[PDB]
Scaffold this active site. Structure first.
Site, PDB file in Angstrom:
ATOM      1  N   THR A 143     -19.458 -13.317  -8.326  1.00  0.00           N
ATOM      2  CA  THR A 143     -19.770 -14.698  -8.723  1.00  0.00           C
ATOM      3  C   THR A 143     -18.818 -15.802  -8.230  1.00  0.00           C
ATOM      4  OG1 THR A 143     -20.973 -13.998 -10.712  1.00  0.00           O
ATOM      5  CG2 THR A 143     -20.133 -16.265 -10.684  1.00  0.00           C
ATOM      6  N   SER A 180     -20.967  -7.094  -8.120  1.00  0.00           N
ATOM      7  CA  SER A 180     -20.134  -6.001  -8.612  1.00  0.00           C
ATOM      8  C   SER A 180     -20.866  -4.928  -9.427  1.00  0.00           C
ATOM      9  CB  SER A 180     -18.929  -6.550  -9.400  1.00  0.00           C
ATOM     10  OG  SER A 180     -19.232  -6.790 -10.764  1.00  0.00           O
ATOM     11  N   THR A 236     -17.459 -10.132 -11.907  1.00  0.00           N
ATOM     12  CA  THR A 236     -17.004  -9.874 -13.269  1.00  0.00           C
ATOM     13  C   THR A 236     -17.614  -8.635 -13.949  1.00  0.00           C
ATOM     14  OG1 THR A 236     -18.620 -11.453 -14.143  1.00  0.00           O
ATOM     15  CG2 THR A 236     -16.409 -12.288 -13.653  1.00  0.00           C
ATOM     16  N   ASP A 237     -18.795  -8.215 -13.497  1.00  0.00           N
ATOM     17  CA  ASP A 237     -19.548  -7.150 -14.181  1.00  0.00           C
ATOM     18  C   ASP A 237     -18.805  -5.831 -14.315  1.00  0.00           C
ATOM     19  OD1 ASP A 237     -21.671  -8.913 -14.482  1.00  0.00           O
ATOM     20  OD2 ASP A 237     -23.140  -7.491 -13.669  1.00  0.00           O
ATOM     21  N   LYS A 289     -15.086  -7.139 -20.162  1.00  0.00           N
ATOM     22  CA  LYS A 289     -16.088  -8.204 -20.263  1.00  0.00           C
ATOM     23  C   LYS A 289     -16.889  -8.082 -21.569  1.00  0.00           C
ATOM     24  CE  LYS A 289     -19.672 -10.607 -17.720  1.00  0.00           C
ATOM     25  NZ  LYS A 289     -20.259 -10.827 -16.363  1.00  0.00           N
ATOM     26  N   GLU A 313     -14.542  13.147 -36.465  1.00  0.00           N
ATOM     27  CA  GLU A 313     -15.994  13.290 -36.486  1.00  0.00           C
ATOM     28  C   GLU A 313     -16.481  14.682 -36.042  1.00  0.00           C
ATOM     29  OE1 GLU A 313     -18.583  11.710 -37.639  1.00  0.00           O
ATOM     30  OE2 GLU A 313     -17.513   9.959 -38.383  1.00  0.00           O
TER      31      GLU A 313
HETATM   32  N   LIG Z   1     -20.497   9.670 -38.944  1.00  0.00           N
HETATM   33  N   LIG Z   2     -23.725  -9.316 -11.501  1.00  0.00           N
END
Ligand SMILES: [N+]
Ligand SMILES: [N+]
Ligand SMILES: [N+]
Ligand SMILES: [N+]
Lengths: 330, 330, 330, 330
Positions: D13, D60, D93-94, D166, D287
């Site tokens: 960009t 990107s 930026t992506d 981002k 977990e």
């Molecule tokens: N969980």
């Molecule tokens: N993009």
């Protein structure tokens, strides 16, 4: 063997009590003693060998400079003992951020000093104080905590005493820093993600042992249509320096500038902070000609923190250019 | 055939100029005229028919109560005209949050009133002001904007004028609210995600047309070792109400309580706000017995915001329970 | 007299247990029944007449579409009863945000529906669940809660079920929204600061009563060097629509575009979301030509929320332009 | 006599162009050449001697593993040269957060490496790219920048390449980190408030000079009613490791656990991350019984970040305890 941790109790909401379990916001601060605080977290015994000491029993909005000094000097004594590995201070939240920055500047030790409070009294349901205290002893117990400056452990975070501020009322996530938490405490374990970059404790040029009493420093707030009234009254009543809590980038109303020039000519240090306290910082010579007027800029420090630094700085210097230096390192 | 939008210029950083493109923080406010601000964004002409009017040319930290009344009156005149669909006010960022809340309280119209500034002068590289101005006209142009209260459009956001505050210095995202943005503006188009829950504009009991004088209201800061000095001085110099910027939940130091009780008996309103301004609110009867002292709590409003409400409310009442009601509704 | 509130228990961490009080992160979810949950907050009796009902006992990461439907239809039944003023659902936190958005879209009632969990099991010290439950019954009890959509009450906040998301692990402030909390709950009292602007409950075009079973919808993640592999496998395994969790503004890798064109030609709805979930939203026709390809843009909704909306939308329509409309209103 | 700084252009960009000044979100990336980016900021010449080199010209989101290795290699070459003091990479930026972490892990230099993009094309009004580029060169020019790891300079901030993500679409403040910025850049000058605590650049055990192939690592999303489909498909198509983007604390659905156990026995590494990406981290053995299954936890790293680390770590090891150690240090 377990580290030896001393808990210095000073009062606060963590020692408070309300009428019922439903009372999480309406209660009395500083009602419970340190030995009863300790007995309420039996799991402490598995982290460290702990002993408790009641330094004072106050609500922290009513703290005085003498209380600060008395706390500071008792910490210095414990830090000097071979018998002490870390220090935890239980403290009310309102001025916790001021006490923690003070201790960060004047205790020349790299033993863990941990300040801890709670946003709900110990009598509320879902009271945050027990785990906060546990976590504080967990961090103070840990060799990895040494050399990191003064730490505050609330909301499962490890926050720097320098720039943590009470930013949100009511909620247990009350304490934030513009620059992030340093790490987190989960089930007794510490996890670090960042280090301090500013001077503190063991590399401080200040020392609680040399300090017999603090200069008077006061804060005046700024806003639309503000006059020089509070500035002159505070100086008249003996303030050696004034923290200007400006709008935006420490800005000064055109009606207030001359008052501050003259107050400076008269020997009162003028320190430009702001009430824009989520992030950013105050730039020297941007809003006002600080060099011209011989003013000091408080950098990123909020008004109550800029007061603490100014007080401590002025026990060593009253040079304005040196004071600016100190505001840029600490 | 496009909407008719009036831009009222008051000065500020948007109209500021610096020495070079690299000067994003060191510059002079209030240098450029409204006609030049507009000419600098020719794309405005696709959004609406715009005419500009220079109301004043000030740096916003130097604003007075008269400046406010003069702006409010000019806004009321324009809002009454049928040739006016929307109003944009360009303003400095320092007290932008104070003017925005003032107009929210006293303009009894549901035409869009949009206040906009910028964090960078228009001469700096990557100046934020052109897009901020464009979005302000886009929001004021839009019928969807009507009935929403006063709006501020910076950082691609539609923020409520009531509780948007300058929270971060230097950065373009300076303005935040505890309760979030109402929506966003992207490429001329407005997107809404929340509505105001508080009384404003057309359902305000206040009217700028019935206000030609505002009472004097001043702010005192509270912190560790604070005294009653600034409180007393401000009251002696004419304050009809004191905003107490307390630690924590509007807490009051033990040594300031007696002077506050006395100032209230002498008839100056005591409004408890705080310098804990990222979230939460100050709860009546929690820290202090407000009922017993006949004090008022400022709810979620920060000190400068609570000043604006107290000043407007006291043109109509000096009953403290009325005052508390108003602080609970607006 | 007290409102009549029914607590529907579904399991979760709020019903969980660990080995010791120190275990706030390592424990078993969904181990305690609703009657024991209720007996642990005796103060509930003073808010409402409450009764408990165990709908299921699950850890919420292992929820199925059938569980959702069964929960949805039991809520609809209670909402229909004169005997019921509000409904509280205790739920695990992992997919709480998905259940809450589901109920927001399909329950056509404006009786308070409150979803509540906890980030620590009830056996931890400083467990958050008791006050969270109290607060949930407090909000469900309140006539002011009617007509606000589905609500979630954690961390002393009142959050909208539409866009609250579990954004922070471990900490009790886990749940955030890009657009802010709607208000707060303190000592039984609700305080509102914003209202919903998106369609919900009583003005929803959807209705749990017409829904016999949900379409299969699945989510594929995107990142550098991503291939079309997961997209095709999910579609092959019967997904009626794919949520694309893109980088940035729902962007699509050039290597993945053709797979999505063909998947669309084959009748699979393509919905562009993102893993950029703190704020902003995905714009139609910005990153990809959505009109050209007949794709849908998920606006501000994160991938697991865009899935819930797509599932519910597709019980009424498989028109892509109508699906875009729905993503822009709900 | 100024520092020597090389700008490596990769597209994005910053080099994007739109139809008009109003087009801040609808435009084409990777349109402008490095020589034009530089010519557009003549003020760069006061910070350093800059030479530009166009490495690629991509949007990107379409980056490949080869693109990464080619960039890393070119960066290593330049870092070895004595005529090179600092390196600036302009990037879309992506996936900016993915390249930045990659270079942080494999460039064994302490010369400043600064990655910078922009949220607006350079043709849009109030484009953020010129000031972002200026600040990137200012930071790379500065000896204080050395030894800090890879840096990203947007929004006036100095963010750590490790954990900057981002996080917000559209807005200029897109990039955030859970642990805060390291400092800020204002008017050419850098200001530091924190240091990295994690291993990087010169103390990394990884070296780009010893990496000529990266293993295939893929990401699966988890949500309500997820199946093992995408997990199996990704493994069948060559994934050497799977990043599980779990709900909550990396939780795994009951019906996906068996397929994960089997994929691990077949030798594909199972790394538990989450889509709970604003703060906190995923805790080993909480977990899921990771020890028993021989799985790895991704700590605080988001799914695309954990992909980059797993891909680099597995060029050197496939022991799972080594892998867990690495995820606990970098
Ligand atoms: N969980
Ligand atoms: N993009
Ligand atoms: N207090
Ligand atoms: N200003």
């Amino acid at each position: 063997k377990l580290a030896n941790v001393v808990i210095l109790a000073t009062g606060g909401t963590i020692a408070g009590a309300g009428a019922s379990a439903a009372n999480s916001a309406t209660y009395q601060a500083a009602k419970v003693g340190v030995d009863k605080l300790i007995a309420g977290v039996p799991e402490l015994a598995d982290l460290a060998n702990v002993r408790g000491e009641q330094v004072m029993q106050i609500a922290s909005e009513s703290i005085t400079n003498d209380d600060l000094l008395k706390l500071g000097k008792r910490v210095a004594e414990l830090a000097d003992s071979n018998d002490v590995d870390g220090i935890v201070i239980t403290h009310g939240t309102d001025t916790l951020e001021e006490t923690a920055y003070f201790l960060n500047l004047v205790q020349k030790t790299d033993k863990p000093i941990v300040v801890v409070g709670s946003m709900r009294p110990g009598t509320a349901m879902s009271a945050d104080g027990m785990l906060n205290l546990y976590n504080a002893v967990a961090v103070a117990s840990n060799k990895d905590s040494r050399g990191k400056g003064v730490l505050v452990t609330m909301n499962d975070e490890i926050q720097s005493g320098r720039d943590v501020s009470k930013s949100i009322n009511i909620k247990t996530e009350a304490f934030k820093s513009a620059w992030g938490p340093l790490g987190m405490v989960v089930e007794g374990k510490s996890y670090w993600f960042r280090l301090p970059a500013k001077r503190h404790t063991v590399n401080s040029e200040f020392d609680i042992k040399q300090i017999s009493s603090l200069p008077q420093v006061d804060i005046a707030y700024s806003y639309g249509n503000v006059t020089d009234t509070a500035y002159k009254a505070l100086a008249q009543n003996g303030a050696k320096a004034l923290i200007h809590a400006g709008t935006g980038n420490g800005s000064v109303s055109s009606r207030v500038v001359p008052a501050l020039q003259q107050l400076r000519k008269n020997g009162t240090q003028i320190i430009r902070s702001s009430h824009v306290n989520q992030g950013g910082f105050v730039l020297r010579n941007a809003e006002q000609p600080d060099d011209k007027n011989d003013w000091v800029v408080a950098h990123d420090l909020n008004p109550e923190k800029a007061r603490i630094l100014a007080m401590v700085a002025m026990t060593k210097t009253q040079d304005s250019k040196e004071l600016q230096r100190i505001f840029w390192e600490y």
